[PDB]
Paper text:
The resolution of the maps enabled us to reliably assign the individual domains, dissect their linker junctions and finally build the atomic models of [name]. The α, β-hydrolase core domain and ferredoxin-like subdomain contained MAT domain have conserved S656, R681, and H763 active site residues, compared with DEBS and mFAS (r.m.s deviation of 1.89 Å and 1.67 Å, respectively). The KS domain adopts an αβαβα structure and contains the conserved C181, H320, and H367 active site residues with r.m.s deviation of 1.57 Å and 1.81 Å, respectively, to DEBS and mFAS. The NADPH binding pocket with bound NADP+ nicotinamide ring can be clearly identified. Each DH monomer of [name] adopts a pseudodimeric hot-dog fold and harbors the conserved active site residues H985, D1174, and Q1178, which are contributed by both hot-dog folds. The S-adenosyl-methionine (SAM)-dependent CMeT domain comprises two subdomains and resembles the homologous modPKS CurJ (r.m.s deviation of 2.39 Å).
In DML biosynthesis by [name], the initiation and elongation of the intermediate chain are carried out by the KS, MAT, and ACP domains. ß-Ketoacyl modification cycles are also repeated, but the tailoring domain usage during each iteration is highly programmed and permutative.
Residue numbers in the entry:
A (entry chain B): 2 to 343, 353 to 451, 471 to 548, 555 to 683, 723 to 735, 761 to 782, 794 to 1089, 1100 to 1231
B (entry chain A): 119 to 235
C (entry chain A): 939 to 1055
């Protein structure tokens, strides 16, 4: 057997999934995995505009080279806070990981076939793997606007605790973090927690979400992420792993515990070992030897010989992150664990190729891929695998990555399909799980419930659509799962229908009506209907549709044939009048009395089969006889026999129905004499007689034949009996009119309310006037359920009695998931945080606009290092790389452009006035980060006057140790519009000795101006008369992150400045005896239209004149 | 002696001011920030330095985290798969994040002392 | 510690009406960031316009003058006199409720630092 393994095999009984690609349920996730699609997409701006953080170089400061991810297509802020009893403020404070974890755990509990009430208060454990808690940073990046419940809402631990808090669980609630392996590690812990027996159930959950750039920037700093945006497992294109948003929850139990609880099994986690990488070549580097040892130890613990193919796993959900350094290690570990100890290959496929590397939940994700696969006998393919990586090829001999949905390899008979899951978290925590397929060696009302009537209506709609989509599913199993294997919730509704069409139409009626009930009460009072209320053709559908009812009818027939020969048999109404199609009227005593008695006997037997605990009050005629059986003291056979033999009232304080010219009068008095004479030779529940007012409300005094005579002779004080029953049992909850509703409804309920002043106890009929018998009884059960949850009655026992063949299956797997309200988006975003996640592109030379910027005040923040600005290496002064003053000028002009765009203005002209360069930014090394903060404040916004005055200051900080200082300052005067401006140049100053550009820059370097590459772009120059002119390359500069050109390449403007020195000094003269740096620019003035036109024209070579005004 | 053995690690950390202080400004974030500040690494790095191969969980059950780790370590020691198990815990005050968050719920003591009972 | 992060953990007191100086501030450019809600400013409930609690224009003026004080202190200067010129109140801050947070960012940039003058 599968339960004989050394360690008790844990079992996945249910799962709840929020996976990318609209995979909001395990079925959709399996469909995606076996039929993968290009799920990955650009990080939606709704989450955070990664383009505001994207840069081709991953190691670029404050950028990420992976602008793609396998993101969920759902609004994570849309959360059913009302469902989980979480207030709006707290729900907003919550980490979307926690909210989706709650939703997925409820989905997994539902799919496993468990009521939240059943698990409520139990020792269920929780183990959540979370690694990428963008919330607690996004919601807390700006400490202001932090909500009151932020602490618990975003705390990593709460991710687990809150789950158990909502479900009232008392088991361990760990929130694990072993990086990518976290969730799988959680499974292991859960497995351990399940093998101790201290927790009958354990949620193993995982959550990774993409809410902020923090994780992207951090991982891209190490180049961990895939710039291509896909986790190309073991492929030659392996360049990292693509982050994926996924929240998984898996209900785990010991196989024996699941079986004894009758929970449908998704798979069997036979063993889950966890090991760690030693002192590998780097903390991030995985170890093949460690993973091989993990696999071998896990198989040994499972009792599986790694060398034996029978004990081997035919599928292996590998970590498969697409990391060029990690994938080869994993392949080597797999090969050396399952091989290398000496012919179908051992299929290896990572779910992260389809749903992405989901970090914390990645393990669980792989587990799901291993679970569904092993359950469906299909080896899911890998979306991204085109060419085996050369590093992985040596270990790929015995391995094959499936590119197609491959049928499971042939197995020895009796051996379950076996798969393996590997998840390695950076740091080296490796979790390995061995999973297998579980070898598996009249209808109830369709009940729905939700925390809100809106959710209940959506549930009705979804169930109608599901029935339309799945008419093949057995209705009995569906209703039994909805009753016994689905949670009960405050807002309740129940649908009555014998077949799929009937239940669908009843669902339509319920949806149109919108009538639902809101908010351990199985106490019912059995009010038994009597003669004169029997309807034609009662039990015709029940008898002809329920074999249990047919067996009851056979017992009634046997009792009928047990009558004295004088009265044996009263002609069988059970086969003459309880017939479909005929529906003959039954008013004759000989048939009407036993007909009603049999109706009530069958109905009460069905109710007891549902384990409904009864209090009994007799009616009149048949209503008494059947009630005598309901007392638990008289056999049903005796009751029906007495009814047949007899065949041959004060209902309420305001109702009296004594009748005559008949029963309770002399008309039937004489026939009562011989009848009783025959009844003498022919024959637990609180039970109260009404035929006898008070005396015969006792167990021993109700068996006398004189009582059965009084049944038709004595007047019936039904009101008094009801009063007695409801006053001696004030704790009574509901009452059921067993038999022919609505004969006794109004007077009985009125009597109940009168006796219990103002206590309108629930009332329910089970066989209406001319209605379908199955529908009538199902509506009675529906009322019971809508009133008292699952405690009203037991459906499992009812189906144990009714239709013993084909025991109901927990089809909760296929039932629609709970329709989470999602009406309100619970999220936290300080407008600074929103401008941070969102906002403009990280403009070159400027970086990102400050979160606290305004249309009137701006602060572009950047950390310039020369290697991140390829051309910046060209501006060197005294050897040190120095940020050009032209750099500050271009920064100011680009800031002016961005400000004008913020006001939807096009700058016709851009002057820079009274500019001063206070402190040259010295770069110690090409990798040194110097902070540049350009603060630009529009002191005048006179677009009405067509002008904009903006005081600008480029503050600089060379090293984080020092404070922020002023690098440059000035003003900007923008001539703007809602979308020849400069004097024509002088007449190309006549005679100018041709300055040897090479010699000019050689002398400049001799004087410390070590200009290089782009800053030697002075094509030609010629100087004379304290003047210079010529042509300099107007080399274009464009922001790759924005895809648009800049006004000026600081190299070109710095060359223009060098023209001033050239006019001042000729090559080889040494008039430039000291290194002059631009300190104070009285007025720059740029025509942005012309500069952009020249940059895009391709000539990128413009003429220049320059006067060395002061020398 | 422990180098290369199956020693486990279970670290309880709740108040990771680092990964926020060092990452509040995404610029200036060092290259090794990912693994340096990642909560999980808190355990893994330990086993990485000591060349341990046992489980390296980094637990977070709020104030109980470290003790929970002990339990897990205890379990890991009762399975026999690890001859030794570090049960560690770490709470540090490097940023106001935790203080502001907890004070928002008034969890912290304004007097500055945990006056038990 | 990014120097912005250092100025965040460290730095001046959270001056009333101003909050905390922005991490990316300078001796020449400053940006005090605050999230004013009336209950956190006990007296602010007194300034109501059409029933709604409105941040006084005098509030903006006092914010500007306190910013001037802090700027002078940053330059180790004592303000003998403090004029506010061409001041304009463009949008009155309407507080929906005493617990509503309205972000106020006072950006003050010393266009002229002529302490010599």
């Amino acid at each position: 057997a599968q339960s004989m393994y050394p360690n008790e095999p844990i079992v996945v009984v249910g799962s709840g999934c929020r996976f990318p690609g609209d995979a909001n349920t395990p079925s959709k996730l399996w469909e995606l995995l076996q039929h993968p699609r290009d799920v990955q997409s650009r990080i939606p701006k709704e989450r955070f505009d990664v383009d505001t953080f994207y840069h081709p170089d991953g190691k670029h400061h404050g950028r990420t080279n992976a602008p793609y991810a396998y993101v969920l297509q759902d609004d994570l802020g849309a959360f059913d806070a009302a469902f989980f009893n979480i207030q709006a403020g707290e729900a907003e404070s919550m980490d979307p990981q926690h909210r989706l974890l709650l939703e997925t755990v409820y989905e997994a509990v539902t799919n496993a076939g468990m009521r939240i009430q059943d698990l409520q208060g139990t020792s269920t454990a929780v183990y959540v793997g979370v690694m990428t808690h963008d919330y607690e940073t996004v919601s807390t990046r700006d400490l202001e606007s932090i909500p009151t419940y932020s602490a618990t809402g975003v705390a990593v631990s709460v991710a687990s605790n809150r789950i158990s808090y909502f479900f009232d669980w008392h088991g361990p609630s760990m929130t694990i973090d072993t990086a990518c392996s976290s969730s799988l590690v959680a499974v292991h812990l859960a497995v351990q927690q399940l093998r101790t027996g201290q927790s009958s159930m354990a949620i193993a959950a995982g959550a990774n979400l993409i809410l902020g750039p923090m994780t992207f920037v951090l991982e891209s700093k190490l180049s961990m992420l895939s710039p291509s945006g896909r986790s190309r497992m073991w492929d030659a294109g392996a360049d990292g792993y693509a982050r994926g948003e996924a929240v998984c929850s898996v209900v785990l139990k010991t196989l024996s515990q699941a079986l004894r609880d009758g929970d449908t099994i998704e798979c069997v986690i036979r063993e889950t070992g966890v090991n760690q990488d030693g002192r590998t070549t780097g903390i991030t580097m995985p170890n093949h030897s460690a993973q091989e040892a993990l696999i071998k130890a896990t198989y040994a613990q499972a009792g599986l010989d790694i060398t034996k193919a029978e004990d081997r796993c035919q599928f292996f959900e590998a970590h498969g992150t697409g990391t060029p350094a990690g994938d080869p290690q994993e392949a080597e570990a797999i090969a050396t664990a399952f091989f290398g100890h000496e012919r179908a290959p051992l299929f290896v496929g990572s779910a992260k190729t389809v749903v992405g590397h989901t970090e914390g939940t990645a393990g669980l994700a792989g587990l799901m891929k291993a679970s569904f696969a092993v359950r469906h006998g299909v080896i899911p393919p890998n979306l991204l695998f085109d060419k085996i990586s050369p590093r992985v090829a040596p270990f790929y001999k015995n391995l094959r990555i499936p590119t197609e949905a491959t049928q499971w390899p042939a197995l020895p008979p009796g051996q379950p399909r076996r798969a393996s899951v590997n998840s390695f978290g950076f740091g080296g925590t490796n979790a390995h799980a061995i999973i297998e397929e579980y070898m598996e060696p009249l209808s109830l009302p369709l009940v729905l419930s939700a925390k809100s009537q809106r959710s209940l209506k959506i549930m009705m709609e979804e169930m109608l659509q599901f029935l339309q989509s799945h008419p093949e599913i057995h209705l009995h199993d569906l209703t039994w799962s909805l009753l016994r294997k689905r949670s009960v919730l405050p807002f309740r509704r129940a649908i009555v229908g014998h077949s799929h069409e009937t239940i669908r139409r009843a669902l339509e009626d319920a949806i149109e009506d919108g009538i639902v009930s809101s908010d351990g009460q199985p106490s019912v009072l059995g009010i038994f209907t009597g003669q004169g209320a029997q309807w034609p053709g009662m039990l015709k559908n029940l008898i002809e549709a329920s074999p249990y009812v047919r067996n009851i009818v056979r017992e009634l027939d046997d009792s009928l044939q047990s009558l004295p020969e004088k009265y044996r048999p009263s002609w069988t109404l059970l086969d003459q009048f309880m017939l479909e199609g005929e529906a003959s009227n039954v008013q004759y005593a000989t048939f009407s009395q036993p007909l009603c008695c049999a109706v009530q006997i069958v109905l009460v037997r069905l109710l007891e089969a549902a384990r409904i605990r009864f209090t009994a009050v007799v009616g009149h005629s048949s209503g008494e006889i059947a009630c005598a059986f309901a007392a638990g003291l008289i056999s049903a056979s005796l009751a029906i026999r007495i009814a047949y033999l007899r065949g041959v009232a004060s209902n309420s304080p305001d109702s009296v129905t004594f009748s005559g010219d008949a029963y309770h009068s002399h008309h039937m008095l004489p026939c009562a004499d011989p009848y009783m004479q025959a009844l003498e030779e022919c024959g637990s529940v609180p039970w109260y007689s009404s035929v006898d007012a008070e005396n015969r409300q006792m167990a021993a005094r109700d068996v006398t034949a004189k009582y059965w005579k009084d049944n038709l002779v004595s007047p019936v004080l039904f009101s008094h009996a009801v009063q007695r029953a409801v006053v001696t049992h004030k704790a009574l909850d509901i009452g059921i009119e067993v038999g022919c509703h609505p004969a006794l409804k109004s007077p009985c309920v009125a009597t109940i309310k009168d006796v219990l002043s103002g206590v309108d106890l629930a009332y329910t009929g089970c066989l209406e006037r001319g209605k379908n018998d199955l529908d009538s009884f199902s509506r009675a059960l529906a009322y019971l359920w809508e009133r008292f949850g699952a405690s009203s009655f037991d459906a499992d026992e009812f189906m144990r009695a009714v239709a013993p063949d084909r025991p109901c299956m927990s089809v909760s797997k296929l039932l629609p998931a709970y329709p989470w309200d999602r009406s309100r988006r619970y999220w936290v975003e300080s407008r600074a945080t929103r401008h941070h996640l969102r906002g403009p592109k990280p403009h070159l030379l400027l970086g990102k606009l400050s979160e606290y910027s305004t249309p009137l005040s701006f602060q572009w923040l950047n950390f310039v290092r020369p290697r991140d600005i390829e051309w910046l290496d060209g501006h060197a002064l005294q050897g040190q790389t120095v940020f050009p003053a032209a750099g500050y000028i271009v920064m100011a002009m680009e800031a002016a452009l961005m400000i004008a765009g913020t006001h939807a203005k096009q700058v016709k002209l851009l002057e820079i006035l009274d500019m001063s360069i206070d402190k040259a930014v010295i770069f110690d090394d090409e990798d040194s980060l110097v902070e540049l903060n350009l603060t630009a404040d529009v002191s005048r916004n006179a677009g009405e006057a067509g002008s904009m005055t903006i005081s600008f200051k480029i503050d600089s900080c060379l090293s984080k140790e020092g404070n922020l200082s002023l690098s440059a300052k000035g003003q900007l005067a923008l001539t703007i519009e809602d979308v020849h401006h400069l004097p024509p140049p002088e007449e190309e100053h006549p005679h100018m000795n041709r300055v040897n550009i090479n010699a000019f820059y050689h002398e400049l370097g001799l004087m410390g101006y070590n200009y290089s590459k782009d800053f030697r772009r002075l094509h030609n120059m010629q100087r004379a008369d304290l003047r210079a002119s010529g042509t300099l390359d107007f080399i274009p500069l464009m922001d790759e992150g924005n895809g648009c050109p800049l006004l000026l390449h600081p190299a070109s403007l710095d060359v223009a400045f060098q023209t001033v020195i050239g006019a001042y000094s000729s090559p080889g003269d040494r008039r430039l005896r000291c290194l002059y740096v631009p300190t104070h620019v009285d007025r720059i003035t740029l025509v942005p239209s012309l500069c952009l036109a020249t940059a895009e024209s391709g000539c990128e070579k413009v003429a220049f004149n320059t006067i060395n005004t002061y020398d």
